Design an enzyme around this catalytic site. Structure first.
Site, PDB file in Angstrom:
ATOM      1  N   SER A  39       0.730  -1.177  -0.033  1.00 33.50           N
ATOM      2  CA  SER A  39       0.011  -0.215  -0.047  1.00 33.50           C
ATOM      3  C   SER A  39       0.953   1.266  -0.019  1.00 33.50           C
ATOM      4  O   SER A  39       0.195   2.246  -0.043  1.00 33.50           O
ATOM      5  CB  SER A  39      -0.996  -0.118   1.071  1.00 33.50           C
ATOM      6  OG  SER A  39      -2.192  -0.854   1.043  1.00 33.50           O
ATOM      7  N   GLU A 135      -3.844  -8.074  -6.294  1.00 31.77           N
ATOM      8  CA  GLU A 135      -2.949  -9.010  -7.174  1.00 31.77           C
ATOM      9  C   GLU A 135      -1.556  -8.426  -6.636  1.00 31.77           C
ATOM     10  O   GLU A 135      -0.575  -9.251  -6.508  1.00 31.77           O
ATOM     11  CB  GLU A 135      -3.083  -9.211  -8.498  1.00 31.77           C
ATOM     12  CG  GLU A 135      -4.300 -10.425  -8.823  1.00 31.77           C
ATOM     13  CD  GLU A 135      -5.462  -9.884  -8.830  1.00 31.77           C
ATOM     14  OE1 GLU A 135      -5.727  -8.567  -9.055  1.00 31.77           O
ATOM     15  OE2 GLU A 135      -6.548 -10.486  -8.805  1.00 31.77           O
ATOM     16  N   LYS A 201       2.900   6.422   5.242  1.00 34.44           N
ATOM     17  CA  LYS A 201       2.010   5.485   4.662  1.00 34.44           C
ATOM     18  C   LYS A 201       2.473   4.180   4.944  1.00 34.44           C
ATOM     19  O   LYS A 201       3.478   3.692   4.542  1.00 34.44           O
ATOM     20  CB  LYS A 201       1.620   6.092   3.335  1.00 34.44           C
ATOM     21  CG  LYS A 201       0.727   4.850   2.387  1.00 34.44           C
ATOM     22  CD  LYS A 201      -0.626   5.103   3.148  1.00 34.44           C
ATOM     23  CE  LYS A 201      -1.604   4.171   2.537  1.00 34.44           C
ATOM     24  NZ  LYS A 201      -1.386   2.889   3.546  1.00 34.44           N
ATOM     25  N   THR A 202       1.451   3.220   5.449  1.00 32.84           N
ATOM     26  CA  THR A 202       1.788   1.676   5.692  1.00 32.84           C
ATOM     27  C   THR A 202       1.793   1.000   4.518  1.00 32.84           C
ATOM     28  O   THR A 202       0.967   1.239   3.738  1.00 32.84           O
ATOM     29  CB  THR A 202       1.098   1.356   6.869  1.00 32.84           C
ATOM     30  OG1 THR A 202      -0.235   1.753   6.573  1.00 32.84           O
ATOM     31  CG2 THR A 202       1.516   2.202   8.083  1.00 32.84           C
ATOM     32  N   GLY A 203       2.189  -0.133   4.445  1.00 29.68           N
ATOM     33  CA  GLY A 203       1.749  -1.413   3.641  1.00 29.68           C
ATOM     34  C   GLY A 203       2.111  -2.626   4.347  1.00 29.68           C
ATOM     35  O   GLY A 203       2.611  -2.711   5.311  1.00 29.68           O
TER      36      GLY A 203
HETATM   37  C1  LIG Z   1      -1.965  -2.331   1.397  1.00 29.89           C
HETATM   38  O1  LIG Z   1      -0.975  -2.268   1.806  1.00 29.89           O
HETATM   39  C2  LIG Z   1      -3.130  -3.052   1.720  1.00 29.89           C
HETATM   40  N1  LIG Z   1      -2.578  -4.454   1.856  1.00 29.89           N
HETATM   41  C3  LIG Z   1      -3.429  -5.508   1.334  1.00 29.89           C
HETATM   42  O2  LIG Z   1      -4.372  -5.312   0.836  1.00 29.89           O
HETATM   43  C4  LIG Z   1      -2.932  -6.761   1.777  1.00 29.89           C
HETATM   44  C5  LIG Z   1      -3.364  -7.404   2.945  1.00 29.89           C
HETATM   45  C6  LIG Z   1      -4.586  -7.561   3.357  1.00 29.89           C
HETATM   46  C7  LIG Z   1      -4.552  -8.224   4.685  1.00 29.89           C
HETATM   47  C8  LIG Z   1      -3.390  -8.220   5.162  1.00 29.89           C
HETATM   48  S1  LIG Z   1      -2.192  -7.927   3.787  1.00 29.89           S
HETATM   49  C9  LIG Z   1      -3.988  -2.314   2.786  1.00 29.89           C
HETATM   50  N2  LIG Z   1      -2.936  -1.770   3.972  1.00 29.89           N
HETATM   51  C10 LIG Z   1      -2.736  -2.161   4.929  1.00 29.89           C
HETATM   52  C11 LIG Z   1      -1.755  -1.269   5.982  1.00 29.89           C
HETATM   53  O3  LIG Z   1      -1.349  -0.218   5.226  1.00 29.89           O
HETATM   54  O4  LIG Z   1      -1.450  -1.518   7.029  1.00 29.89           O
HETATM   55  C12 LIG Z   1      -3.181  -3.282   5.691  1.00 29.89           C
HETATM   56  C13 LIG Z   1      -2.616  -3.607   7.004  1.00 29.89           C
HETATM   57  C14 LIG Z   1      -3.913  -4.356   4.675  1.00 29.89           C
HETATM   58  S2  LIG Z   1      -4.890  -3.530   3.774  1.00 29.89           S
END
Ligand SMILES: *C(=O)[C@@H](NC(=O)Cc1cccs1)[C@@H]1NC(C(=O)O)=C(C)CS1
EC number: 3.5.2.6
Length: 256
Positions: A39, A135, A201-203
């Protein structure tokens, strides 16, 4: 060394790059190693959206359907019937990591290939957007699709938010959204002293991928730009945010 220690403690691979804009001092640990950006790319995607549109244009309201909904649609799942404006979509995307909202913004800018092209234009030859959510979160070791590196993510984030790929009024929006992020409290924010502003911003993705990218402001003087990326070697691994917080503290000490 402290980063090696953290890899050892959390059984994970760390990707770190930090640039003190004040002094051009850097902290680097596997800075050019690729990880799934997950993300974190939503920040750069908003940067391209802001390049493309006037502020007043961000008030265009977008109508979308359940089809457009994916998972983690905390804001967008509420407004299927009313639509949301582009500004509201950017807000949701950045501050709640709302996946559908990012997907909608990506479509407005021309999709992943168009995102790549605009990133290339700003000087980033590393980041490789290819797929939509979900994906893009599924990246196997050695694959380069939907990966970037700590160094490149820092360089592109700085360029949009602090340098001249955007004008000041648009830079101010980006920074404000990222400052008011809801999703990063246990990551880069937890390794910086209270009173130091953080925009981040996290991912999160497969192979335990757990990312935070950030601009950190000391009380006075120029900001630090930082990416802390991590991944683990099993596909379904879990992540521990605490790795990111601890890595952040090591960076701050290395810089101070
Ligand atoms: C982006 O990093 C998104 N991640 C995903 O969609 C993959 C996953 C879904 C569930 C676990 S990993 C979104 N962002 C974040 C975040 O930034 O913290 C999370 C935790 C999952 S949705």
């Amino acid at each position: 060394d402290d980063f090696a220690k953290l890899e050892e403690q959390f059984d994970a691979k760390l990707g770190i790059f930090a640039l003190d804009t004040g002094t051009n001092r850097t902290v680097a640990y596997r800075p050019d190693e690729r990880f799934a950006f997950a993300s974190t790319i939503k920040a750069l995607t908003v940067g391209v959206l802001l390049q493309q549109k006037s502020i007043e244009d961000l008030n265009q309201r977008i109508t979308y359907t359940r089809d457009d909904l994916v998972n983690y649609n905390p804001i967008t799942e509420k407004h299927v019937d009313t639509g949301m404006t582009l500004k509201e979509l950017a807000d949701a995307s950045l501050r709640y990591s709302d996946n559908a909202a990012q997907n909608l913004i990506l479509k407005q800018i021309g999709g992943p290939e168009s995102l790549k092209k605009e990133l290339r234009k700003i000087g980033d030859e590393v980041t490789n957007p290819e797929r939509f959510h979900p994906e893009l979160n599924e990246v196997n070791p050695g694959e380069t699709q939907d990966t970037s590196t700590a160094r490149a993510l820092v360089t592109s984030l700085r360029a949009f938010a602090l340098e001249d790929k955007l004008p000041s009024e648009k830079r101010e929006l980006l920074i404000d959204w990222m400052k008011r992020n809801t999703t990063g409290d246990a990551l880069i924010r937890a390794g910086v002293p209270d009173g130091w502003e953080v925009a981040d911003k996290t991912g999160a993705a497969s192979y335990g991928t757990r990312n935070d990218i950030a601009i950190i402001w000391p009380p006075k003087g120029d900001p630090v730009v930082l990416a802390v990326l991590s991944s683990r070697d099993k596909k379904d691994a879990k992540y521990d945010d605490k790795l990111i917080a601890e890595a952040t503290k090591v960076v701050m000490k290395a810089l101070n």
